[PDB]
Design a protein that fits this description.
This is Nuclease A. It comes from Staphylococcus aureus. It is a single chain. The protein is mostly helical. The protein is built from one helix and no strands. The termini are far apart.
């Protein structure tokens, strides 16, 4: 699997600060 673009999204969302 790739799951590359995801990690680059969940991270930003991990502390996006709403």
């Amino acid at each position: 699997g790739p799951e590359a673009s995801a990690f680059t999204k969940k991270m930003v969302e991990n502390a996006k600060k709403i």
